[PDB]
């Protein structure tokens with residue numbers, strides 16, 4: 638995908654997220670549709686979704702794709718690395734990468750943007766592509782701005798679903 | 801009509817995934833992924849959880865969808881209100897239907913109950929007409945049963 642079109646796709650992506658979340662704070666509906674949205678803008682996406690922090694590790698959250706890894710310990714895997722340092726992590730080639738937890742998929746490249754609030758790790762937004770070297774700094778800046786529109790629009794509260 | 805083995809392989813696959821895993825989020829999320837990958841005509845496969853007064857979009861597989869469904873509204877509100885699995889053979893000639901995907905032609909919603917409480921519903925949309933019959937209701941209610949006994953409805957570990 639051309640750089641100018643990637644840039645454009647991301648501009649409509651982040652705007653649409655703002656339009657979608659306008660007036661909606663539910664973390665469940667937001668996290669869910671967010672993954673649906675990303676998946677609809679990037680065809681190479683083989684996985685788009687979240688992994689939330691259960692307090693001790695990362696457990697699978699709303700996502701788009703095939704059956705995936707359930708839990709992930711910090712430091713381990715691309716997602717584990719990201720959650721640890723709390724910084725985006727990109728992987729050009731996943732087949733020659735050393736710390737990559739392969740939960741199937743035809744993922745050749747992957748990126749993980751950490752979600753943070755009040756110095757606390759809420760979890761991570763992760764995307765896998767069917768193409769090698771498919772994520773760069775452009776993807777990094779827009780996905781972080783995405784996560785930012787997400788958290789800014791979402792009240793991290795699961796209260797309403799208990800009992 | 802061997803839609804049974806398909807569903808057997810599916811439900812056996814399900815128990816295996818929840819084997820030693822009770823997190824509501826991890827479980828509901830993979831359940832939608834599992835259904836989706838196992839049934840080709842699936843346009844939407846996911847859940848709508850009850851927030852106290854209405855249905856609210858939860859872990860699903862599909863395009864961007866409706867966020868909240870009032871009880872009694874649409875096929876999801878129906879299934880929720882009557883706490884009984886509902887089936888629609890032709891989504892277009894069904895009056896009380898809520899469209900969130902233009903490619904959906906038939907739909908089946910199966911309620912999720914626990915201790916006389918509505919937890920939510922499992923909603924499946926197909927791109928084919930009358931693609932769901934009594935066989936789907938049996939096997940999907942069998943899916944939900946297994947899902948609800950191996951899953952602890954607890955979000956507390958994500959709060960704060």
Ligand SMILES: C[S@@](=O)CC[C@H](N)C(=O)O
Nearest residue numbers: 705714715716737738740
């Ligand atoms: C859904 S599945 O792709 C997840 C985890 C990830 N690739 C890892 O190295 O952490």
Ligand SMILES: C[S@@](=O)CC[C@H](N)C(=O)O
Nearest residue numbers: 865874875876897898900
């Ligand atoms: C996600 S979508 O298929 C929603 C709706 C449902 N068919 C309606 O009658 O409730």
